[PDB]
């Protein structure tokens, strides 16, 4: 039964981080007067976990943005290549956003290029699709939400060669259609482009 | 404004894990972007990262047990000093409403 008291508000541990905030500790361990044989104990508060403050911000690694919109599909010195069998090229852009304070840079290629045919504003033959899956209730949490499924006039893409050769090497590349065409089809229920149907949503809950 | 500062943001649960201390300001605790903060300790565990949209929650239970109903799910713009995609301040919720159908049997008793 040796009476134990408190030692120092003890020697400081160094701030364990070179950036931002960290947690040092000293506490006050029951070391200069140790309770022995299981008698009394050290009375008070032994807790010190201290917030050390380093005035240097930490590096943050930059994250990728979403992929942009596809550029118009043209070819150099070939007028307009719309509705023809002339393969062109198109581009898309991203943005490395958020890298500050000597952080790591974005890992990857920032540009995406593919070969394309230009189908922008070209008249095509079409066929009516079936009823799509029922959409969400719009507007949610507002006055009278309604569902929406639709049959749209899907264009029939022309049977062009799906690959193209390269001049420098014999290996071939993909071709992918791009554009907003004007599909031609017979009418269904008084519409030429898209016929939809709205049904209101039942038992709308509070948000 | 002094706010409780945590050491690790557990993603996909929204819970602030590993407590560092209290009373420190928001500008000092978020110097390390792997941290998280919690004001008033009643909720709203926000990470120190840039404001990005969190994951969508699971669907709420169907508002009726019979025929066509409706169910919600929310998403909270988590982050600090920035705006989410669409001129959206941090802390704003976004909901999605879908019609469900638990069963096709009604008044069984």
């Amino acid at each position, epitope marked *: 039964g040796v009476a134990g008291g408190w030692g120092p508000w003890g020697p400081v541990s160094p701030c364990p*981080v070179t950036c931002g905030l960290g947690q040092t500790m000293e506490q006050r361990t029951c070391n200069h007067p140790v309770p022995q044989h299981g008698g009394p104990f050290c009375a008070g508060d032994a807790t010190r976990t201290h917030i050390c403050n380093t005035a240097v911000p930490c590096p943050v690694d930059g994250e990728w943005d979403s992929w942009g919109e596809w550029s118009p599909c043209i070819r150099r010195n070939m007028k307009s290549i719309s509705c023809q069998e002339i393969p062109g090229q198109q581009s898309r852009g991203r943005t490395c956003r958020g890298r500050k304070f000597d952080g790591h840079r974005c890992a990857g290629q920032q540009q995406d290029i593919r070969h394309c045919y230009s189908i922008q504003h070209c008249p095509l033959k079409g066929s009516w699709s079936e009823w799509s899956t029922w959409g969400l209730c719009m507007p949610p949490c507002g006055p009278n939400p309604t569902r929406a499924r639709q049959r749209l006039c899907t264009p029939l893409l022309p049977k062009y060669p799906p690959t193209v050769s390269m001049v420098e090497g014999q290996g071939e590349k993909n071709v992918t259609f791009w554009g907003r065409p004007l599909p031609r089809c017979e009418e269904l229920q008084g519409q030429k482009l898209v016929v939809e149907e709205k049904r209101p949503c039942l038992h709308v809950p509070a948000c | 404004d002094p706010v409780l500062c945590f050491t690790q943001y557990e993603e996909s649960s929204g819970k602030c894990k590993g407590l560092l201390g209290g009373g420190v300001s928001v500008e000092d605790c978020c110097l390390n972007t792997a941290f998280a903060y919690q004001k008033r300790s009643g909720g709203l565990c926000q990470p120190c990262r840039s404001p990005r949209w969190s994951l969508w929650s699971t669907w709420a239970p169907c508002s009726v047990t019979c025929s066509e109903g409706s169910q919600l799910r929310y998403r909270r713009c988590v982050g600090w000093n920035g705006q989410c995609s669409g001129k959206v301040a941090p802390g704003t919720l976004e909901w999605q409403l879908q019609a469900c159908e638990d069963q096709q049997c009604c008044p069984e008793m």
Partner: nanobody
Amino acid sequence: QVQLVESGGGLVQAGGSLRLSCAASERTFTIYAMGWFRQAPGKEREFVAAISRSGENTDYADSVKGRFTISRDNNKNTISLQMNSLKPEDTAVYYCAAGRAILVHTTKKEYDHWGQGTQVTVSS
């Protein structure tokens, strides 16, 4: 930055005991949370025991729990791994590991600073 030196290995019979010690750099000791690893002949590196910067919160693997007891001496810049009831499957090169932890009560499993190691061989 920090350097680690291990000692305490040897040839112990089956059922015997062996106590390991790890000497680190003194100027950057309480910065790093430290633990013990091992690497048997023909296996990957295995987590054994970890200890926080306080010594209060401890963490062990499931293969050494109950038999092993990790302790931290914050005054002599050493950690100890009391290995009781040594089996022939404990024959490995025990590495002392040092890794930065922000809280004083957080144990880690990933560490960036490692040492040369010490040889422990258990025979039957």
